[PDB]
């Protein structure tokens, strides 16, 4: 899904002249990226603690 | 493209599952050799008795 979002931004870069607005959808896309990052942090932390107890 | 994606997905699932089973199978074999030499030594000493 991260790759899909990146591709969607990439296609969005194809817009033209006065039809390139800060459509709040793009703000939501940025928050999409940051949500993914937070999830990844949580996952890796849990993996680490599992390793120590192993 | 939609179907092509889930094709790859099921392939990946298969990969993961098969690798896990392989690991534990080879573990069991590694243990059974030890059992084998145990019984062989037992045979030797009972013959001596």
């Amino acid at each position: 899904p991260l790759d899909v979002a990146i591709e969607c931004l990439t296609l969005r870069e194809s817009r033209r002249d006065i039809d390139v607005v800060r459509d709040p959808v793009e703000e939501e896309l940025l928050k999409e990226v940051e949500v993914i990052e937070a999830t990844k942090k949580v996952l890796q932390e849990k993996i680490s603690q599992a390793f120590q107890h192993l | 493209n939609l179907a092509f994606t889930n094709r790859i997905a099921e392939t990946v699932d298969a990969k993961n599952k098969i690798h896990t089973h392989l690991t534990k199978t080879l573990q069991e074999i590694f243990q059974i050799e030890m059992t084998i030499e145990s019984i062989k030594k037992a045979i030797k000493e009972k013959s001596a008795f």
Binding site: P1, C8, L11, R12, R15 | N1, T5, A9, E10
Partner: peptide
């Protein structure tokens, strides 16, 4: 002309999120 191009681009980027419907499955019933 420019407006039509914008519309077509929007539909194009819309469609791809059928990918995010898992491996085209239900997961939860």
């Amino acid at each position: 002309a420019c407006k039509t191009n914008t519309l077509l681009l929007d539909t194009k980027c819309m469609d791809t999120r059928r990918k995010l419907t898992v491996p085209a499955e239900k997961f939860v019933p």
